[PDB]
Amino acid sequence: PLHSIISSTESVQGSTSKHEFQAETKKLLDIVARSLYSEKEVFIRELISNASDALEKLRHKLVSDGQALPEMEIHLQTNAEKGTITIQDTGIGMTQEELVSNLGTIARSGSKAFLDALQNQAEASSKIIGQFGVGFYSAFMVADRVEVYSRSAAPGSLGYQWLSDGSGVFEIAEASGVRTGTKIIIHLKSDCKEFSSEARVRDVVTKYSNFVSFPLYLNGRRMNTLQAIWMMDPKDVREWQHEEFYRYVAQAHDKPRYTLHYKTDAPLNIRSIFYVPDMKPSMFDVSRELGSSVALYSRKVLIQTKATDILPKWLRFIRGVVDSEDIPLNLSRELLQESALIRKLRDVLQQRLIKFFIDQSKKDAEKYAKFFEDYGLFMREGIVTATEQEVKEDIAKLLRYESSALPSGQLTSLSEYASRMRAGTRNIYYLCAPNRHLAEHSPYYEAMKKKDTEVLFCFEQFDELTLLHLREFDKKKLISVET
Amino acid sequence: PLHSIISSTESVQGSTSKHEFQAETKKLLDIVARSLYSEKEVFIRELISNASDALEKLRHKLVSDGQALPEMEIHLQTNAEKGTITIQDTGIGMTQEELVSNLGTIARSGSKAFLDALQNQAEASSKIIGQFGVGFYSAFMVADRVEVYSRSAAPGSLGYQWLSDGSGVFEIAEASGVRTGTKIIIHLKSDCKEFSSEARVRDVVTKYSNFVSFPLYLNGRRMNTLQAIWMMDPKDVREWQHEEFYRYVAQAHDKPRYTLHYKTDAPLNIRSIFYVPDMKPSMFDVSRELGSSVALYSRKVLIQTKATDILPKWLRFIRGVVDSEDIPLNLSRELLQESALIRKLRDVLQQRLIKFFIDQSKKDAEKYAKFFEDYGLFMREGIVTATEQEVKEDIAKLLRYESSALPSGQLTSLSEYASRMRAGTRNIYYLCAPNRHLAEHSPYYEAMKKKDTEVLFCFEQFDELTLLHLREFDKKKLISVE
Ligand SMILES: Nc1ncnc2c1ncn2[C@@H]1O[C@H](COP(=O)(O)OP(=O)(O)NP(=O)(O)O)[C@@H](O)[C@H]1O
Ligand SMILES: Nc1ncnc2c1ncn2[C@@H]1O[C@H](COP(=O)(O)OP(=O)(O)NP(=O)(O)O)[C@@H](O)[C@H]1O
Ligand SMILES: [Mg+2]
Ligand SMILES: [Mg+2]
Known part of the structure; x- marks a missing residue:
């Protein structure tokens, strides 16, 4: 009995009116602090990424202008007494207008805007991490108060303080003396005091930010030590x-x-x-x-x-x-x-x-044989669990067996077996036994010996089960000799 | 080697100005459509939860006013020819201000404002799904256009049309007729045509919303026939x-x-x-x-x-x-x-x-033994990989063995061997063999059985590895007879 209420009744009668989407900012901040990240610690990953972006922007400006690079560094300080964690960088800093706009507007990303202005024709195009514009607000997971000092690298710029508890209000005031770049002081919450422990922060840096491209100092001690070798030639x-x-x-x-x-x-x-x-x-x-x-x-x-x-x-x-x-x-x-x-x-x-x-x-066959012995079970599992036959046959190219046409211990592939089949022979024949002796004494193999047929010899655990699931290779049926 | 640039040099010389946070509204909508959900079908879950919440509000309003409920239903229609999916509910609906506010302000949640007003004192306090105020925007994942018809259940309420392409503006105009409720019409994109197919939508509904509390119909067909029995006493x-x-x-x-x-x-x-x-x-x-x-x-x-x-x-x-x-x-x-x-x-x-x-x-020991045979490998694994000794011993309470003090085939726990341990004795002794015949004729058992001590016989795959990782049970050490 099909039951439906849906039909087109509606006739718009009137004049329309246009509106702009709004947002509830205090709540959006709480979504970031509460409902976004799986772990409170990632605020360290977010602030270090911002420090890296700020230095990357400064490097791009100075190299383009022929100025010398100053100390380019990211510093972390834990004060357990004061219950604080502090990050400071020597990058581009922020003018007063930049503090207001880039910290005070949710989803506003200065670094994305920097990226778009390049036409991605520069070197920093692929080194800049930020896009979304929410990452800084991760600090309100662990912070009662966030205290920002920043001074822009641009000429004539002074230092400013930026202050918020995450209420939907922040305060800005002039400040001195502020080093060029940005200093973020996080006053930790009651349950978040573990981020004023050096050992704890050390683990968080090592987990997330270990490969950052600028020297990173935690409480005075350098850290990274590890090049990202996947990026290298x-x-x-x-x-x-x-x-x-x-x-x-x-x-x-x-x-x-x-x-x-x-x-x-x-x-x-x-x-x-x-x-x-x-x-x-x-x-x-x-x-x-x-x-x-x-x-x-x-x-x-x-x-x-x-x-x-x-x-x-x-x-x-x-x-x-x-x-x-x-x-x-x-x-x-x-x-x-x-x-x-x-x-x-x-x-x-x-x-x-x-x-x-x-x-x-093909490069080293005896090494591969040892790898097949040690890991071949995984290839057998992969052939068994796969669904598309094309996967099964790709993984099956890695398998190895002995052969009735080769000396004891010589390994062959399914391909090499296929190469050796006679003009019209349609099938790949196989026998699964604990060793080559028991295979050759099989009454079912002795019958094959009367003919010219090659038989694969499979001694590995789950060989037969693997061959039953693979079921054919290169459009040739895999047939046990025991049938 | 001690190098740090952080010391407190900073002082405030200046006047404070106070500011409110702002938001980049069109980008916030872009984040929701791209960077939030792992699958785009989830917009159907989100719209069904909003339908369910509208119906739960109408139900709460009417019941607390002593009123009989009208038909409480959720309907979906796919149209392949027109490239649309449509959801309509008979619940509380929206006035014009509620349209401008609840759909128009990102993170504004009318359902959460409702739940707040109820302070966990009402049946609906546990049934309202929405909190965040973003879930409706999930439709811009799959949509070119979203046109909305709503009429509040407030007596003598007008119907209205809310129309948006998701670009950061929307339009509002009066409409008739609009059934009391909300009808959302999604005009799907090229790649999203997809959800205009009844077979695909049918799959999404039963995956997420199969247990929704109100009768749900898809192209006239009744979707949720299955009660959520974990809620039942x-x-x-x-x-x-x-x-x-x-x-x-x-x-x-x-x-x-x-x-x-x-x-x-x-x-x-x-x-x-x-x-x-x-x-x-x-x-x-x-x-x-x-x-x-x-x-x-x-x-x-x-x-x-x-x-x-x-x-x-x-x-x-x-x-x-x-x-x-x-x-x-x-x-x-x-x-x-x-x-x-x-x-x-x-x-x-x-x-x-x-x-x-x-x-x-303790209830059925014969049934438990078969469960132990079939599922024992899982408790051996959890005992090996457990970090805490007491978790190891907790799981190990489930293990069974044969025993030199019991007839062949009878099982025992570690607790029951412990409770037969004599006064002056110390450890739990065990022997792993393929079966009881080998365990009884084992060389290390003959050198043992002369004594008065009981020894477990463990025939299962990975029994040895398991007992080696356990090492102790109830503070009595586990010693192989080797
Ligand atoms: N240490 C810093 N120095 C200078 N500018 C900064 C610093 N941290 C943040 N900003 C600016 O403030 C903006 C907001 O930062 P944030 O909220 O992390 O967004 P994002 O880094 O742009 N994008 P994402 O990190 O992907 O959310 C950044 O785009 C920068 O323009
Ligand atoms: N079908 C509907 N009927 C009546 N009101 C609705 C309907 N859909 C949405 N609304 C209103 O619009 C608001 C926004 O919906 P939505 O964007 O899903 O946020 P939410 O449901 O409050 N929270 P979440 O779903 O957790 O993001 C809701 O809280 C309702 O007040
Ligand atoms: Mg960032
Ligand atoms: Mg919702």
Whole structure:
């Protein structure tokens, strides 16, 4: 019994009137403090990003004008006694009009406006982090009061103080002496006093801002120490560098047995590094039912420490970093947005890694065999779980087997088997047994021996199950010899 | 090496001027359409919650005035030819000022102003979904134009038309006829044509809004036939409904082997149903097994289909729903605002489900043993990966073993071995073997059984690894016979 009330009754009768959308500013601020970020700590990531942007703008001006660069630095000070955290930078600072407009207008982004004015023809075009114009207001998560001192690098500019508790009102007054650049003093809330602890702030800086491009000093001590090697030309990164960075991003004590440094500007911008550990995972690690973990960055800022969306699940044995400007960030900057173009990135990363391994098998075959023994279970899992047959056959190119036509211990591919089939032979034949002795004593294989047919010999755990799910390769049916 | 440029040099010489924050209004609307939600279909969830809130206000107004309710309904129509989706509700509607204000001011929430006026003293205090005042703007994700017809239920109210292309201006004009209620007409973009298809919209509705409290119709068809039984008092929900709801929320064709209907207030208000499937996990390594969780709801709106945060990973085999009316939501309403509030909830649920399974072992021990065989791997994993010893020992209360002091096949807990420990004894002794025959003829057992001591026989995959990570139970150390 279909029931509907919807029909076109409505006839606009009258004169119209036009209005502008308004906003409730005090509430928008509270949305930022309460309902936006998953963690209170990211206010440090937001303020450091602003400090980086302010220095990047100053560097752009001075290099364009032929002036010498001064100290370009970001400083953090925790005072536990006073219950404060303080960030100060030596960048462009702000005039009084800039404090009013850029701090006082929600979603107003001076750095986005700077970007648009370049025609993105300069070097800072890809180094500038801010877009949304809300990031500063993250401080009202942890702050009772926020106290800003700023002095613009422009001629004749004095210092100003900017003061707000987040009420929808701020105060501005002239101030001295203020160093060129910006100093933000955060008076922490009752439950937020942990951000006046040096140890705590240190961890927050290291987690989010570790790769920032200007020297960062916490309570007098330099920090970064870590170059973002995914941004560099691959030919410029030593093995020592890849080893130390792998130990960092993977929290591991071993070495990478494989390193793929993948940079592409099309279709998407990708700065990525992927590592395969030396150590072989245990069956417990494998069955622990995890997803992919790869740290995700944009413009050197951490997005997520382990992003599960960027690599397929069968490639969770891989450790590394992926950086992109292209893919747009969620307003909270803790995740990505458009799901189809994420999946475009994942398909590209999947194809690029399968090509990497196919190439490692041709480059060094005995090394690849050891990698297949240690990681081949993941490829078997990936073939079993995949849905599109094209994925199954791509992953299946990595598999290796013995052969009745090769000596004991010699590994072959499905491709190499296909190359060796006779003129009209339509099928890839296989036998799954614990070892080559038991395979060759199979009564079902002895029948094959009367003919000229090659038989694949599969000794690995879940080989047969994998071949039943893969079911064909290169349009040739995979047929157990035991049927 | 001590270098810092921060010292307090600053003094205020000058006069203070006071200012109000402003906002860039068209960009704020752009942020909502682009940078907020992970999927664009969510505009349908947002419009249905607004329809539901309008109906809940009309219901509250009328009941407190002693009035009979008129028909309370939510309708959607897709038109593929015209490229539109339309939602209409018979609820409270909007005067002209309410149109200018509630649709025209970003973050202005009439529903939240309502809830505020009710101060948690009314039925509607727990049923009103809207807080933020942005959710209606989610339609500019998918729309070229949004034309709105509303007529307030205030007697002798005129109808009006609110029209916007989302560009930062909108238009208002009088209209007749407008049924008391609100009708929203969305003119979809080229890429969004999509939601002009009934099949697609039908999928979105059942995903998010399937439990909305008022009758919902899509092209005349009745959408929500399924009651939200986690809200019902537990003893009112019979086995037929659990079986059917289990199949819905788990996407499963079997029956639950166990069912726990759980309500409490601490740390939050929980209304939850937990199921263990009759089938047994296909072990194996992973396939879809990132997945297969409890769904998270708030005020009968889906937050997350697989709620990752609210149960420990080792409890991921559980299916069901957890609904909380007070749970802090992310602005996107796809996530939770992290707190001790979620982590306390996760521990309250872990404690509650461990208590559940202990109790099931005491009611039917034969049924519990089969659950232990099928689902034991999950508790071994949670014991290995747990950080805190007491969580390890809590989960370990669920483990069973055979024993040298019991007939072959009979199980035992660690507690029951502990309670047979003699006066002058010390540790819990265990032997892992493939079966009881090997455990009894083990060389290390013969050198043992001469003594008076009891030894567990552990035949399950990863029993050894599990006991090595536990290391201790009830402050008695776990010692292999090697
Ligand atoms: N340390 C600083 N020095 C100079 N200008 C700053 C500083 N911090 C913020 N500003 C200015 O104030 C504006 C507001 O900052 P913020 O609210 O973080 O927005 P945003 O950085 O532009 N965009 P996003 O960070 O993506 O939200 C910035 O665009 C800058 O123009
Ligand atoms: N169908 C409707 N009928 C009557 N009033 C409505 C309707 N839709 C929206 N409104 C009013 O317009 C306001 C804005 O809606 P919306 O932008 O969804 O904000 P919200 O629902 O208050 N909060 P949230 O949904 O949490 O962003 C609501 O609070 C209502 O007062
Ligand atoms: Mg910023
Ligand atoms: Mg709403």
